[PDB]
Design goal:
29% helix, six-stranded mixed β-sheet, four-stranded mixed β-sheet, globular
């Protein structure tokens, strides 16, 4: 047993606290104890983070773990390993498993599997409708009480506006978001219903300038609408890039989508170097990049993660923004390989991931 850990010599960035600079972090018994220039205490393990960025552990709010149902493509274990290698300490799994996440048995399965794997926290979402069939609303209260943090029929958009409106009403009562998603009309419908219900809607896919302008319209009017983009897809790509620059897009989300034969691509391990390309091209600041992986996704799902506040669980990611590497058979932790980044030089690499004060990944 080791009780204390010092992360020394790193560049700490914690946007939730407007904190940034060359600081050490003292972790004691799994929680953040002190952040200061220079810390040294006896009987501590020391990580030397010189030349690295130290930030809250990343949160990935759109992952397909294919478990249950298609576990030859990915499973909770392999997806969890991809996630911590990518710097993520918390991942949110989508409910289009087989069977789908529409009852408490499936929720329990995912939570028990995740506890047995012991790498990142896996938060389940539930379906909006029973069987994702689009007709009959699921039991949100029971699903939420079992652990679901959001609801979506992901895979297939909810088509009936009356179903979406009911879901947003129930969601508003429970304080959780609905995740959704011809594109432009659906986003407008969701914003309008979010405004009328007081519900929070998260838009999972935006591909056009008009879509971004509509979202920004709703955000300016104070509607609880947020959206995401997959950094791996950024390299209407140019319109998306402007949306990121202007702050319309709240968060990066991988949409890790394992396949073995739009197209969905795997993404957990490459999210960071992809995002860092936007930083190197001057599209976003480093602080904004970290926000979009930490505090912003944390706020979208309403969890007290994505910070380095004192007393918080010590979920910490430590990365080298300039380290070149390649996603290939030597580094891939997924059961699938479906990404146009396969075999290409990436720049930016997680070096350590720490969850509850324990090193769960090391480069
Ligand atoms: Zn999806």
């Amino acid at each position: 047993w080791m009780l204390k850990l010092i992360v020394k010599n790193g560049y700490v960035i914690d946007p939730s606290q407007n904190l940034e600079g060359e600081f050490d972090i003292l972790v004691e018994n799994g929680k953040i104890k002190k952040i200061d220039k220079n810390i040294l205490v006896p009987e501590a393990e020391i990580i030397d983070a010189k030349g690295l960025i130290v930030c809250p552990g990343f949160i990935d709010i759109h992952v397909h773990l294919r478990d249950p149902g298609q576990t030859y493509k990915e499973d909770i274990e392999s997806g969890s390993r991809c996630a911590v290698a990518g710097g993520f300490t918390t991942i949110v799994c989508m409910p289009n498993t087989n069977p789908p996440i529409d009852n408490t048995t499936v929720v329990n399965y995912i939570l028990q599997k995740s506890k047995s794997v012991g790498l990142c926290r896996v938060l389940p979402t539930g379906t909006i409708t029973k069987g994702r069939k689009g007709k009959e609303i699921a039991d949100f209260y029971s699903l939420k009480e079992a652990g679901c943090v959001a609801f979506t029929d992901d895979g297939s958009p909810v088509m009936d506006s009356s179903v979406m409106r009911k879901a947003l009403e129930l969601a508003s009562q429970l304080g959780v978001p609905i995740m959704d998603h011809a594109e432009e009309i659906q986003i407008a419908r969701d914003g309008i219903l979010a405004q009328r219900t007081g519900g929070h809607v998260h838009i999972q896919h935006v591909s056009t300038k008009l879509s971004l302008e509509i979202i920004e319209f709703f955000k300016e009017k104070g509607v609880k609408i947020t959206c995401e983009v997959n950094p791996n897809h950024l390299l209407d790509r140019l319109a998306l890039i402007e949306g990121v620059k202007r702050g319309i897009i709240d968060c990066f989300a991988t949409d890790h989508a394992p396949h073995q034969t739009m197209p969905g691509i795997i993404g957990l391990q490459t999210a960071l170097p992809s995002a860092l390309e936007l930083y190197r091209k001057g599209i976003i600041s480093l602080k904004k990049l970290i926000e979009m992986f930490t505090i912003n996704p944390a706020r979208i799902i309403g969890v007290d993660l994505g910070t380095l506040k004192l007393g918080s669980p010590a979920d910490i990611t430590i990365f080298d923004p300039n380290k070149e590497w390649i996603l290939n058979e030597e580094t891939n932790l997924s059961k699938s390989r479906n990404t146009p980044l396969w075999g290409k030089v990436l720049k930016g690499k997680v070096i350590y991931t720490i969850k509850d004060g324990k090193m769960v990944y090391k480069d």
